[PDB]
Design a protein around this nucleic acid. Structure first.
Lengths: 51, 52, 58, 49, 148, 185
RNA sequence: CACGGACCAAGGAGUCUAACGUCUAUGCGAGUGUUUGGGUGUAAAACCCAUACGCGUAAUGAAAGUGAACGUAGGUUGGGGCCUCGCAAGAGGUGCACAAUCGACCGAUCCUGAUGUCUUCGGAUGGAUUUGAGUAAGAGCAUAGCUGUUGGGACCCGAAAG
RNA sequence: AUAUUGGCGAGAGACCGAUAGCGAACAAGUACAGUGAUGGAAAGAUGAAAAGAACUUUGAAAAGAGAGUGAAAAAGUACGUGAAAUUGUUGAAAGGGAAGGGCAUUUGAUCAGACA
């Protein structure tokens, strides 16, 4: 089954209602591809400069 | 719903969650568990004694 | 102005940095230049000897 | 000029092409304009489709 | 990234990787395809055979849509059928319920007989077919309906 | 001074580590480095070296290529090992139940094997099943079927796919290609 | 006893782009490419998407056109690994990729011209020291990086001219 | 629907930061040159506030020396920070037609380490 993460209230106390993991957290964690994608995505908001 | 699971597909067309090339992230557990330890030769010394 | 027309100097030294290699002979060499009449008969000779061997294992 | 095996390229850049370079920086800017034009049109052409 | 280029590694070296006798100039051998028949012939022949001259007949005002004829081999012939209904036709091979495959709607003009098909009667609607593509289809109990 | 016969400080020229930065691939390299060192099995040394290969040195293996290998004599129960990506082939219609081990599986290929009762296994799960490679069979993809291989070794009287952008009439077919215009190649 | 350099400070020379080759990394994979555009938005970002289109999955001929299984998709030789036997050495079996070679199939070319024939149409079957950038259980597409190429002012500075 | 180095009104930048960026951050198309068509610069920074040094003394005067202002005149309208070439003074050392350098040590100067 899923680790059954606990839902918390706005004011401290952990409500006894639990939810399963959405299975997106079990995806592979690849710091290398997230690196290369970030450098290209972060260049999509550049304004052109020229003399 | 947004990324999908083994039940709901993706809610995005033609998309699936990525697969793993290795089933676990702890290589030490695989080596020590039951089967590799019975098929491997005995270990060395982790540092060779300087001879001559 | 004249120049050096030709010399064989350093040519053997260059050839021996990657020294002289044989043409890497193989079994069953290429049948190029063989008599076509012989190859025409040899083609049908290999065809028939692959039929008796195939018929020997039923 | 011709060496080092490569497909023969046909690049038509022998004129003053640098004077007629059009870079579409306004692709995001004009897209907002089309949506703005479509929005301000629909109010003027009340509820026609 | 200019920081990974060899220009940064050439800082301090006089010739910058171009040599002291060569003395890198503007255009030592010409511009573009210059001298393909005079001083680049050894490169034109040997790695570009056939560059000079004409062979065919001219075609004035060629429209590529006139020669539109995508080919589909007998290899698949079933990816055009959806995967959900593919299995229920394979394990129920029989006439009077033969699937109708319109290869024109899928974007194909001619059917070619490269692959081998299972022994299932299949109705094929195509503009063109190969000679032995029809033979393999008819041997399996199918027919080809010529369309336009 | 020493009269050197061979080149000094000459590296072996073979990959000792993967060129990639994949953390999960390095775990498989770490797992198989231990196996290739302390098991004395020749299977573990082949797999470890195959993990170092590049993308063009790891051609995809079709699921149909697996089925042909399983039709050999006494090979129907041999575990198929592919160091690379296993791709789906729709040209086949019958597939056996034999387990297939690979680095990656495409959506069609993984579904095709599981539908036929087979099993998709990663290379780490094979280590606990076959530490020395019991009852295995290694399958590699074809290397010379690549498009870049066609232009390799081009020259006169070779027929080795001249590098061209546009193909057809008027593109490198007249002088040096037929007897009519001077000579043929 | 060839040229530049009296001295000091700052500035000062392989860059960018279009199209590409090899190699490498990544994603998907007989497919691949969201960003022409549309939807949406915390507003040049991010996120989502239809239909087409590009390349690839078929080639070959000047063209009309035709168009890749006699067969466990072939035989032979070498083959990593695996399997069986063995105390081991070795022996046998199976042998992917790759290498060499002989065949098969597709197109072109040169011949052979069957049943049928609006009597000149039709091209079955069989070949050929011929030929193709082919088939023979697909590998490509996209992005990024180094290097290299071509056009651009094109590493920087320089003419006599027009 | 499309174009837009001009004009007007706006919002921005992985752009340049006074030999850069428009030729021009300043009384810049200004000073200035050419008969003329045209050519065409250099030049930003005291301090928070002038509080920009009253007054005394020497000198013909400019200024100097005190005093004074200020957190700082090592901020005084030659003004933030003030490098190098080059120059003065002081101190140290050396020098028989160059000087400078390398290895090694003497001598002088200077610095360092650690108290079971």
């Amino acid at each position: 089954s899923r680790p059954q993460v606990t839902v918390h209230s706005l004011t401290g106390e952990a409500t006894a209602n639990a939810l399963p993991l959405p299975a997106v957290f079990s995806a592979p964690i690849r710091p290398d591809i997230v690196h290369t994608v970030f450098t290209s995505v972060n260049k999509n908001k550049r304004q052109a400069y020229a003399v | 719903q947004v990324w999908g699971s083994e039940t709901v597909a993706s809610s995005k067309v033609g998309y699936t969650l990525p697969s793993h090339i290795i089933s676990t992230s702890d290589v030490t557990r695989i080596i020590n568990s039951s089967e590799i330890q019975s098929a491997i030769r005995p270990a060395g010394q982790a540092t060779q004694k300087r001879t001559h | 102005a004249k120049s050096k027309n030709h010399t064989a100097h350093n040519q053997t030294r260059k050839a021996h940095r990657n020294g002289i290699k044989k043409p890497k002979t193989y079994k069953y060499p290429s049948l190029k230049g063989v008599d076509p009449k012989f190859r025409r008969n040899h083609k049908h000779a290999l065809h028939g000897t692959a039929k008796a061997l195939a018929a020997a294992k039923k | 000029a011709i060496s080092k095996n490569l497909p023969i390229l046909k690049n038509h850049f022998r004129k003053h092409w640098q004077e007629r370079v059009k870079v579409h920086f306004d692709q995001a800017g004009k897209k907002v304009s089309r949506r703005n034009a479509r929005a301000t049109r629909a109010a003027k052409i009340a509820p026609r489709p | 990234p200019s920081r990974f280029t060899k220009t940064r590694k050439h800082r301090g070296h006089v010739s910058a990787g171009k040599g002291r006798i060569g003395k890198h100039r503007k255009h030592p051998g010409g511009r573009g395809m210059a001298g393909g028949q005079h001083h680049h012939r050894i490169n034109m022949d040997k790695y570009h055979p056939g560059y000079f001259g004409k062979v065919g007949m001219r075609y004035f005002h060629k429209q590529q849509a006139h020669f539109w004829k995508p080919v589909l081999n007998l290899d698949k012939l079933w990816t055009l059928i959806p995967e959900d209904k593919r299995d229920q036709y394979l394990k129920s091979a029989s006439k009077e319920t033969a699937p109708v495959i319109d290869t024109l709607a899928a974007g194909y003009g001619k059917i070619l007989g490269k692959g081998r098909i299972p022994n299932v009667p299949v109705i094929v609607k195509a503009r063109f077919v190969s000679k032995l593509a029809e033979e393999k289809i008819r041997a399996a109990g199918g027919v080809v309906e010529l369309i336009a | 001074g020493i009269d050197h016969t061979s080149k000094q400080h000459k590296r072996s020229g073979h990959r000792t580590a993967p060129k990639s930065d994949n953390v999960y691939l390095k775990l498989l390299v770490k797992l198989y480095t231990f196996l290739a060192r302390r098991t004395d099995a020749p299977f573990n040394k082949v797999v470890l070296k195959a993990l170092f290969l590049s993308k063009i040195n790891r051609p995809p293996v079709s699921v149909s290529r697996i089925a042909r290998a399983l039709k050999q004599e006494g090979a129907a129960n041999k575990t198929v090992v592919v160091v690379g990506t296993v791709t789906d082939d729709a040209r086949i219609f019958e597939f056996p139940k034999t387990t297939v081990a690979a680095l990656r599986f495409t959506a069609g290929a993984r579904a095709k094997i599981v539908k036929a009762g087979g099993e998709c296994i990663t290379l780490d799960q094979l280590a606990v099943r076959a530490p020395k490679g019991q009852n295995t069979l290694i399958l590699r993809g074809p290397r010379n079927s690549r498009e870049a291989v066609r232009h390799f070794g081009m020259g006169p009287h070779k027929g080795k796919a001249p590098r061209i952008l546009s193909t057809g009439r008027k593109f490198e077919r007249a002088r040096g290609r037929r007897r009519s215009k001077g000579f043929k190649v």
